[PDB]
Amino acid sequence: SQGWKYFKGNFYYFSLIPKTWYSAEQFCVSRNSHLTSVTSESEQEFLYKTAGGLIYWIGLTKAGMEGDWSWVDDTPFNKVQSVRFWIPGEPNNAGNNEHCGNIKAPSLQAWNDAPCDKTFLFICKRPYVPS
Amino acid sequence: GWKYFKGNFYYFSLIPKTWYSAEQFCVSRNSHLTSVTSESEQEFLYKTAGGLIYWIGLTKAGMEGDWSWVDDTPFNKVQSVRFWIPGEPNNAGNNEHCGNIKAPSLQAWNDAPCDKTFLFICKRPYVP
Amino acid sequence: GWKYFKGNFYYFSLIPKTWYSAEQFCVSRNSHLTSVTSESEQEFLYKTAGGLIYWIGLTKAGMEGDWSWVDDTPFNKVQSVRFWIPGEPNNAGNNEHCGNIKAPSLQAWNDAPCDKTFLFICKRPYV
Amino acid sequence: GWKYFKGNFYYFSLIPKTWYSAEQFCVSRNSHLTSVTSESEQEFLYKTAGGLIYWIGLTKAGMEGDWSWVDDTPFNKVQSVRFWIPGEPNNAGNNEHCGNIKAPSLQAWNDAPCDKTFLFICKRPYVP
Numbered sequence: 232s233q234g235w236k237y238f239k240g241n242f243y244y245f246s247l248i249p250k251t252w253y254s255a256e257q258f259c260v261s262r263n264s265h266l267t268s269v270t271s272e273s274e275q276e277f278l279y280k281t282a283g284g285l286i287y288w289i290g291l292t293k294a295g296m297e298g299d300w301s302w303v304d305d306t307p308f309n310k311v312q313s314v315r316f317w318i319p320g321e322p323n324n325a326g327n328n329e330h331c332g333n334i335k336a337p338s339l340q341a342w343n344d345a346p347c348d349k350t351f352l353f354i355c356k357r358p359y360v361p362s
Numbered sequence: 363g364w365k366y367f368k369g370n371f372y373y374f375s376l377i378p379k380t381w382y383s384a385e386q387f388c389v390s391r392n393s394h395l396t397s398v399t400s401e402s403e404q405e406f407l408y409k410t411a412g413g414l415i416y417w418i419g420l421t422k423a424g425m426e427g428d429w430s431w432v433d434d435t436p437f438n439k440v441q442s443v444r445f446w447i448p449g450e451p452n453n454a455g456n457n458e459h460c461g462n463i464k465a466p467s468l469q470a471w472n473d474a475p476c477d478k479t480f481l482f483i484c485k486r487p488y489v490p
Numbered sequence: 491g492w493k494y495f496k497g498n499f500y501y502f503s504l505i506p507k508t509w510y511s512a513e514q515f516c517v518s519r520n521s522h523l524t525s526v527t528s529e530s531e532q533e534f535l536y537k538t539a540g541g542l543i544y545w546i547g548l549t550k551a552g553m554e555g556d557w558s559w560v561d562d563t564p565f566n567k568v569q570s571v572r573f574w575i576p577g578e579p580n581n582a583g584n585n586e587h588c589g590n591i592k593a594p595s596l597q598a599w600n601d602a603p604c605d606k607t608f609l610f611i612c613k614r615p616y617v
Numbered sequence: 618g619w620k621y622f623k624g625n626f627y628y629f630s631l632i633p634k635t636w637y638s639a640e641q642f643c644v645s646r647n648s649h650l651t652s653v654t655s656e657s658e659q660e661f662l663y664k665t666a667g668g669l670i671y672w673i674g675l676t677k678a679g680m681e682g683d684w685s686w687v688d689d690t691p692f693n694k695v696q697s698v699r700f701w702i703p704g705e706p707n708n709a710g711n712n713e714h715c716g717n718i719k720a721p722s723l724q725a726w727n728d729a730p731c732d733k734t735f736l737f738i739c740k741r742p743y744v745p
C-alpha cells in the first residue's frame with residue numbers, strides 16, 4: 232500500500248478515512264503497525280509538519296488504575312520528555328471523558344486529549360526491518 | 363458489585379459503552395474485559411448475562427484478523443470454535459472486529475462493530 | 491517431535507537448559523514454555539513427563555513477585571494452588587523464582603532457581 | 618543508588634547475574650534492564666559503565682530471532698546498528714541471544730550467552 236512515509240527507521244501512514252481511536256488502532260494492527268508513538272523532537276516535527284491542518288489520532292491513551300498516559304505500541308511513557316509536546320492548557324480532560332490523544336496544532340506543542348469514541352484521521356507507525 | 367467464580371471476580375456493567383471505552387473502564391478497576399477459556403466459565407457468563415448482550419475481551423489482532431483476548435490469554439481456535447453462535451463470526455459489513463456474549467447457550471458469541479455500545483463484563487483475578 | 495493435546499502442540503525437550511534459555515528455544519520455535527490452565531492439561535503434562543523434571547512457563551513477575559505465565563496467560567492463583575507439590579513454592583535460599591513440573595501427580599509443580607538446568611516443555615497453539 | 622538522565626533513573630549493579638536473573642532483579646525494583654534509544658543515552662551508559670561489562674535489555678524475540686528490548690520499547694534496527702561493536706552481533710557458538718554494553722564507545726554492544734554472569738543496568742522512568 233502506498234501512503235507510507237519513511238522517517239528514521241520507521242514508516243508512517245497518515246490515514247484518509249477517520250475512525251475512533253480504537254478502530255484506528257485496529258486498522259494499524261491489520262497493517263502490522265500501531266498508532267504512532269512520539270519519542271523525540273524531530274519525530275514530533277515530522278508528524279505535525281506532515282499533518283498540516285488536519286487532526287490525527289496518535290497512540291496516546293490512558294492506562295492502568297491511575298489512568299496515566301501510555302503508548303499503545305508499549306513504548307514506556309516518559310512524562311518528563313513529553314511535557315513539551317502538549318498544547319498549552321492540555322490535557323484538560325473535558326467532561327472527564329478525554330482518555331485518548333491526538334495531534335492537533337501545527338507546532339511542537341501539538342497534542343490534545345479527546346474522547347476515544349470521537350472519529351478523526353489517524354497515524355500508524357511500523358518499523359523497517361532490514362535484512 | 364463484583365461476582366466471584368473460580369478465582370476471578372466479574373463485573374457486569376449497568377451502563378453501555380463502546381468496546382474500548384468498556385476496556386478502559388475495566389482497566390481503571392484493575393481488570394480487563396473478560397476472557398473465556400472453559401465451558402464452565404462460558405456457562406457462568408451467559409447464565410449471569412440473563413439474555414442481554416455484553417462486550418467481552420474478544421478482539422482482532424495481527425495482519426490475519428486472528429481473534430485475540432485483550433487480557434492476553436492466548437486465543438485457542440480449536441477450543442473456542444464451539445463458543446460462537448452458528449454462522450458467527452460473519453464480519454457483517456466488513457466492520458465487526460470485537461466480540462460480545464449474546465445468545466444464552468454455549469454457542470453464545472457474536473462479532474460486532476467495536477464502536478457499538480453494549481453492556482460489558484470485566485474480569486479481575488483474586489490474589490491472596 | 492511435537493505432541494498434540496486439545497488444540498495445542500507440546501515439545502518435551504531432550505536437552506536441559508536454564509529457564510530463560512529454554513524459553514528462548516521455545517521462542518525460536520514460535521512457542522513459549524507451557525502454561526497450565528486446567529486439570530486435564532496438568533494431567534496430560536505430568537503423565538507425559540513420566541517422572542522427569544521439566545521447566546514450565548512459571549515465573550515470578552511484577553514488583554510483588556507473584557507467580558505468572560511467560561506466555562502472558564493471566565495466572566489464577568486460587569485455581570493453581572492445587573497444582574503445587576505440598577509445601578511448594580518454598581523459595582529455598584530465597585532464590586527460586588521459576589517453576590517446573592516435578593512430581594507425577596496433580597500436585598506436580600516445584601519452584602527452583604531460574605539458573606538451574608532442566609528439561610523443558612514448550613507449547614504453541616494449533617493455528 | 619539510582620542515577621538520573623533525561624526522564625529515567627538507572628541502577629548500575631554491584632553484583633553480577635545471568636541476564637534473566639538480572640531482569641528479575643530489575644522487575645522486583647519496578648524497572649527493567651535498560652533500553653537505549655539515542656546517542657546521548659548510549660554515551661551516558663557507557664561512560665557511567667567505566668569500562669566494565671553490563672547486561673542491558675537486549676534479547677532476541679520472535680521466530681526470526683530479531684533483537685528486542687525487554688522493557689517493550691519497539692526495537693529500531695535501523696537506528697541501532699550504530700551501537701553495535703563492529704562485527705557484532707556474531708552469535709558465537711550459535712548461543713548468544715542476549716546483549717550487553719561492552720566497549721567504552723558509541724559502538725559498545727556485544728551479544729553474549731544469556732547464561733553468563735555480568736553486572737547489569739536497570740532503567741525506570743520517572744513517574745510523578
Ligand SMILES: O=S(=O)(O)N[C@@H]1[C@@H](O)[C@H](O)[C@@H](COS(=O)(=O)O)O[C@@H]1O
Nearest residue numbers: 321323324325329343344345346349
Ligand atoms: O481551547 S479549547 O477549545 O478549550 N480546546 C478544546 C479541547 O481541549 C477539547 O478536547 C475539544 C473537544 O472536542 S473534540 O472534538 O476533540 O472532542 O474542544 C476544544 O478543542
Ligand SMILES: O=S(=O)(O)N[C@@H]1[C@@H](O)[C@H](O)[C@@H](COS(=O)(=O)O)O[C@@H]1O
Nearest residue numbers: 449450452454458472473474475478
Ligand atoms: O444472522 S445474522 O443476520 O448474521 N446476525 C446478525 C449479526 O451477525 C450481526 O452482527 C448483527 C449486527 O447488529 S449488531 O446489533 O450486533 O451490531 O445483526 C444480526 O444479529
Ligand SMILES: O=S(=O)(O)N[C@@H]1[C@@H](O)[C@H](O)[C@@H](COS(=O)(=O)O)O[C@@H]1O
Nearest residue numbers: 577578580582586600601602603606
Ligand atoms: O521438600 S524439599 O526437599 O525441601 N523440596 C526441595 C525443593 O523445594 C527445592 O526447590 C529443591 C532444590 O533442588 S532443585 O533441583 O529444585 O534446585 O529440593 C527439594 O526438592
Ligand SMILES: O=S(=O)(O)N[C@@H]1[C@@H](O)[C@H](O)[C@@H](COS(=O)(=O)O)O[C@@H]1O
Nearest residue numbers: 704705707709713727728729730733
Ligand atoms: O572478535 S570476537 O572474538 O568474535 N569477540 C568475541 C565476542 O564476540 C564473543 O561474544 C565473546 C564471548 O565471550 S563472552 O564473555 O561474551 O561470553 O568473545 C569475544 O569478545
Ligand SMILES: N[C@@H](Cc1c[nH]c2ccccc12)C(=O)O
Nearest residue numbers: 293294295296297298330386390
Ligand atoms: N479521570 C481519570 C480517569 C481514569 C482513571 N484511570 C483510567 C484508566 C483508563 C482510562 C481512564 C482512566 C484519569 O484521568 O486518570
Ligand SMILES: N[C@@H](Cc1c[nH]c2ccccc12)C(=O)O
Nearest residue numbers: 550551552553554555587641645
Ligand atoms: N518474591 C521474591 C522477590 C521478588 C519480587 N519481585 C520479583 C520478581 C522476580 C523475581 C523475584 C521477585 C522473594 O521474596 O524472593
Ligand SMILES: N[C@@H](Cc1c[nH]c2ccccc12)C(=O)O
Nearest residue numbers: 514517518677679680681682714
Ligand atoms: N539463529 C537465530 C536463532 C533464533 C531465532 N529466533 C530466536 C529467538 C530467541 C533466541 C534465538 C532465536 C538468531 O539468532 O536469530
Ligand SMILES: [Ca+2]
Nearest residue numbers: 452453472473
Ligand atoms: Ca456478527
Ligand SMILES: [Ca+2]
Nearest residue numbers: 580581601602
Ligand atoms: Ca522449591
Ligand SMILES: [Cl-]
Nearest residue numbers: 245246247248
Ligand atoms: Cl485510510
Ligand SMILES: [Cl-]
Nearest residue numbers: 366367368369
Ligand atoms: Cl467458584
Ligand SMILES: [Cl-]
Nearest residue numbers: 374375376377
Ligand atoms: Cl456500570
Ligand SMILES: [Cl-]
Nearest residue numbers: 400401402403
Ligand atoms: Cl469446564
Ligand SMILES: [Cl-]
Nearest residue numbers: 568569571572
Ligand atoms: Cl486450587
Ligand SMILES: [Cl-]
Nearest residue numbers: 568569570572
Ligand atoms: Cl480448584
Ligand SMILES: [Cl-]
Nearest residue numbers: 568571572573
Ligand atoms: Cl487447593
